[PDB]
Swiss-Prot record:
Transmembrane segments: none annotated. InterPro entries: Cellulose/chitin-bd_N, GlcNAc_Chitin_IntDeg, Ig_E-set. One of its GO terms (biological process) is polysaccharide catabolic process. This is Lytic chitin monooxygenase. PANTHER family: CHITIN-BINDING TYPE-4 DOMAIN-CONTAINING PROTEIN, GLCNAC-BINDING PROTEIN A. Involved in chitin degradation. Catalyzes the oxidative cleavage of glycosidic bonds in both alpha- and beta-chitin via a copper-dependent mechanism, leading to oxidized chitooligosaccharides with a dominance of even-numbered products. Acts synergistically with the chitinase EfChi18A, and combining the two enzymes leads to rapid and complete depolymerization of crystalline chitin, especially with beta-chitin as a substrate. Is likely involved in a chitin degradation pathway that allows E.faecalis V583 to grow on chitin as a carbon source. GO terms for cellular component: extracellular region. It is found in: Secreted. Pathway: Glycan degradation; chitin degradation.
């Protein structure tokens, strides 16, 4: 169990630690660390919740529904916090393509992968800091999809992150 704390994930922003910058986020208010589903689950319109019971409110998609972190193109530091550390296979990062539609359900086919970090089947620390590159054809509102793949289970944790690139 874990979440992306910086830039705050959509679920994390639903919690008091995230400043309640998103309202009406279901289970994300209290347990943004709990978005666990099998690896390679990418159901259109169910990316933010990973299809998990109680996280449905996260799946709403409009241009103005969610709080964004202002970022630039180029390097971006990602910080995860793990409430329960697990042996790790992988960390994968995706971002919406230039020209995507922020008022349509999220579809992984409309993202590019932009980073992939091998977990080496080791147990990470409670705070994990990584740096990924935001491509320079992205401007304005985008969604980063951060995926922590567990080493000793068939599952992953899924973190949609709303950013405003300027
Ligand atoms: Cu866990």
């Amino acid at each position: 169990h874990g979440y992306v704390a910086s830039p705050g994930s959509r679920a994390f922003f639903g919690s008091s630690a995230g400043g309640n910058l998103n309202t009406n986020v279901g289970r994300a208010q209290w347990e943004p660390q709990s978005i666990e589903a099998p690896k390679n689950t990418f159901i259109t319109g169910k990316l933010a919740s990973a299809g998990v019971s109680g996280f449905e409110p996260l799946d709403e998609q409009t241009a103005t529904r969610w709080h964004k972190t202002n970022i630039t193109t180029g390097p971006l530091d990602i910080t995860w916090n793990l409430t329960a550390q697990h042996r790790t296979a992988s960390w994968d990062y995706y971002i919406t393509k230039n020209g995507w539609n922020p008022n349509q359900p999220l579809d992984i086919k409309n993202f590019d992968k932009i980073a992939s970090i091998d977990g080496k089947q080791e147990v990470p620390n409670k705070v994990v800091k990584q740096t990924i590159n935001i491509p320079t054809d992205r401007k304005g509102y985008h969604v980063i999809y951060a995926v922590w793949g567990i080493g000793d289970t068939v599952n992953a944790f899924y973190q949609a992150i709303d950013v405003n690139i300027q």
